[PDB]
Amino acid sequence: MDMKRRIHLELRNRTPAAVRELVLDNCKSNDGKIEGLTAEFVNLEFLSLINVGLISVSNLPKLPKLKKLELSENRIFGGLDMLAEKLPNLTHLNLSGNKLKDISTLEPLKKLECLKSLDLFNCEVTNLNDYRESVFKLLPQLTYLDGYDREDQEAPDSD
Amino acid sequence: MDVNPTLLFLKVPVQNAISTTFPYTGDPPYSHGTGTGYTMDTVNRTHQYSE
Amino acid sequence: MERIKELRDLMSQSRTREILTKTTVDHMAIIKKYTSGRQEKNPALRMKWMMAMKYPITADKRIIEMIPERNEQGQTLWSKTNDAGSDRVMVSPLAVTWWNRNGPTTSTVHYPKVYKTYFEKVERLKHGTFGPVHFRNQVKIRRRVDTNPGHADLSAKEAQDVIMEVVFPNEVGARILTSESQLTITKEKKEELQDCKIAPLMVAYMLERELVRKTRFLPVAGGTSSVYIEVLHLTQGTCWEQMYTPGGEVRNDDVDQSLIIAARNIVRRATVSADPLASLLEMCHSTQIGGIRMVDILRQNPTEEQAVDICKAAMGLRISSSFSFGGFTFKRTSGSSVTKEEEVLTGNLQTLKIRVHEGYEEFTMVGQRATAILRKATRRLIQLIVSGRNEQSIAEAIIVAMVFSQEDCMIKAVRGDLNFVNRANQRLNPMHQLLRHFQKDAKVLFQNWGTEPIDNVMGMIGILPDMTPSTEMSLRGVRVSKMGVDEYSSTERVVVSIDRFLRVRDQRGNVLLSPEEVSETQGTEKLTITYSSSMMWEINGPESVLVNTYQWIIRNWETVKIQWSQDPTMLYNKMEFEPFQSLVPKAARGQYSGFVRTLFQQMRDVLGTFDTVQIIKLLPFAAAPPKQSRMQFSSLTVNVRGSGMRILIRGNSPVFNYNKATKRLTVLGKDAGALTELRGFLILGKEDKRYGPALSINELSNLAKGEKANVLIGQGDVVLVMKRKRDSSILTDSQTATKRIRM
Amino acid sequence: ALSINELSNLAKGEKANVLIGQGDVVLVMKRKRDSSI
Amino acid sequence: YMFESKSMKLRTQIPAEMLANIDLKYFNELTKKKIEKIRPLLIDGTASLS
């Protein structure tokens, strides 16, 4: 079941304007891009693209209200500049298990105003020295990187 | 960053930070050269240089 | 179309019509054995004769259209002779090689999985490790060991039900359709063998070869595993041992120990009850070890442990005549005995009552790390021969025999007070009290036993009281044996009467397994044990209580949901949640409950918030006299073994996590079950034309919850069938009708 | 008792016991009002 | 020297005193050359080192 199918399977005869949390993981990508979602999704605030073979997020929809996006287990190697404009209100991003290999790749996220968490587990960029410090200086608004704030104090629950 | 301690020599002369290049302060836990092979080789070398 | 013509012409002659009409489908296998011919004596000679002539091997009349009569050199591959009487044309073995060379290719992806029981051997040897050959004089005991690794611990009868459901779905019988035991293997194999064209009969044979266990009573000299016995020819020899290690995978024998633990708990809580038999039977038919009903496990496994033995005996199952004492099972070979409880005085002049076993008898004392043969008369240790590995095992066997020697020397040699209690603080058997009293030290008892000379007959090292070798001086009647002592090849299964106090006597009157010699340990089972009685949940500790509560809520999800959405007050005060409320802190049962109750109300008010997982997680906290407080809890505490665990309202936690991408819920690591965020039919009568022509067992998939259709059940007869309403099981409901009359 | 690392999960107004020191346990109540310089 | 047979799982030792007669097939090429070159100097198990 590719995205276009499961989306409708998850649409559940409920109009796109009335979805607030959509879960689409392990499904597929057309070739390496999200296909099936459309801008009519306006009430969505939790999209989970986990394990969907995804080579980029170029053709992502426009979700004003998105706040909890997660692209873990995919193979994004850049092109995150789109997420800034297309998800102005995103405040919880989960890029774990992807193919990011440089701090430069995370430069585009600097212009997201309301960012609160960035999970970056199992990514080749996490093997660097002064990794967390460099990330926290490139993304000053961040207050939880990988789960801990600044002194390795776990992020409080109920987020 | 990828830490490269040798790059420290770009700022401090080598003789100032020469201690950096000495790996061990103590007898290592391994035997470097010994046994019948390294003795026969020494005998052969000594005779070769005077053949 | 041709087969029906064959049947018609068979019935035309009025001599086979008798056989074809009067022989019920039951009496077909006994007709199938009226073969003709004389088979063949000396088949090797016949083969050497056949291969000399041409056209030895018969083949069906299809080669003609797919194998040329002559290869590219003019050699007749096949002939036209119709061996004996049949359509099979004779063929020369050149045809086999012609097929293997210029033949129709194919894709073989179903072979490495249909023949798993051989490729497993291949991949297990391919990764084996070899060690140096040691030429020590090998001692080879004669153990009975498993010779089928990965047998999937099925019997020889339920394997047939698996085969009939994987390879012959349209010939399944009534005993399967009108059931609720689907098994897991039958859903994996059905998926794997979905398009196999191999050989339905061969697929069945391979499946029953893979899904059965066998034993051989082989001369083993180490290892004893299920995988070390296939390579016995490679590992051990008459004078050599080639150290070796199969490199495949092993079986986890955890179901057996879980069964042992469940049997122990059930027997305790049934004997501490008013009517032990009813409790035992109801628990067996209701309790489940890792999902499977305990009755199926008891009728499936061969495990031989005391508690399981009593559980089987109370269920009218044959139990081994051998009795287990001190970890060694004692198979009687000869003699008779009588318990004859008599009185004695211990070393400290303490009165004691012990069953003086009166009568001369010989036992084989087989054990895990030692073996022995012990023949004794009343208070007379006539002879004890021991063997095993190291002197520790030899000493263990010797002391076990000495304790069960009926000699008063051990009784009078006691040092201390023989007042021993178990984990349950109960009065153990005085002989058993002696057993544990002496299990640690017996030096003074060895000195009392003394030492006598030995004549060095055939080579038999004697054992000194210091547990050391001696070629001349050895303990009394104790003769450590070299060249090993062989075990037995039979168990002599018998039915034994059970008294009302969990003492398994027999028709002869000798106790085999007293209930007091069962509390060896009370560790934690690896699987999950589920009980159908709210009282039982508070037996194995907080972990079991939580797991059973959540599994019960899952079991009855539809009823819980309807009652929660319609009559919440009744649901919030059921009995099943009283054990759970024992864990919750006393000073917070109310404040918690209200918070849940109010929150639950929020789900009934606004639609779209009906979260199954949240409701199941938070429901057990509702049962309480709820209070009111503005506090908005984030996590609710629970007391487990004195530690405060926490259950998260919104999210997952160790006490409760429902894994997404799957329907499985886990509580404290222990598996709870499946939560949803063919079979089950009932026969009604013979053919009824009002419902139209008969169906096949496949088409029955297209029926409603109560629609009636007539199907061709099994091999032959057609029976009207209908889907079932209500679970309709054999749980306590059947017991109630039977136990109520037993008043 | 709750380890001092776990009491951070208590909600406002909750009360529980914590191992606050050497073999010592005390009852602690979370303040609804949060004060800070 | 120490000879190891990995097909028989054997670990034997050859004392230096036997280097004057042992067949020169077990050793590798470099050790074989060393032994061959030093053999003329072997007296009573030692090796002259003037």
Swiss-Prot record, chain A:
Cellular component GO terms held in the UniProt record: cytoplasm; extracellular exosome; nucleoplasm; nucleus
Keyword Nucleus: yes
GO biological process: inner ear development; negative regulation of apoptotic process; negative regulation of cell differentiation; nucleosome assembly; positive regulation of protein export from nucleus; regulation of apoptotic process; roof of mouth development; vasculature development
Residue span, LRRCT domain: 123-159
Keywords: Acetylation, Chaperone, Cytoplasm, Host-virus interaction, Leucine-rich repeat, Nucleus, Phosphoprotein, Repeat
Tissue expression notes: Expressed in heart, lung, pancreas, prostate and in spleen, thymus and placenta.
LRR repeat ranges per the UniProt record: 16-40, 43-64, 65-84, 89-110
Residues where Phosphoserine is found: 158
Mod. after translation: Some glutamate residues are glycylated by TTLL8. This modification occurs exclusively on glutamate residues and results in a glycine chain on the gamma-carboxyl group.
Superkingdom, taxonomy of origin: Eukaryota
Location of N6-acetyllysine modifications: 86
GO molecular function: histone binding; RNA polymerase binding
Function per UniProt: Multifunctional protein that is involved in the regulation of many processes including cell proliferation, apoptosis, cell cycle progression or transcription. Regulates the proliferation of neuronal stem cells, differentiation of leukemic cells and progression from G1 to S phase of the cell cycle. As negative regulator of caspase-3-dependent apoptosis, may act as an antagonist of ANP32A in regulating tissue homeostasis. Exhibits histone chaperone properties, able to recruit histones to certain promoters, thus regulating the transcription of specific genes. (Microbial infection) Plays an essential role in influenza A and B viral genome replication. Also plays a role in foamy virus mRNA export from the nucleus to the cytoplasm.
Domain notes: Histone binding is mediated by the concave surface of the LRR region.
The protein's assembly and partners: Interacts with histones H3 and H4. Interacts with KLF5; this interaction induces promoter region-specific histone incorporation and inhibition of histone acetylation by ANP32B.
Family: Belongs to the ANP32 family.
Name this polypeptide is given: Acidic leucine-rich nuclear phosphoprotein 32 family member B
Gene: ANP32B
Full-length numbering of the shown residues: 1 to 159 of 251
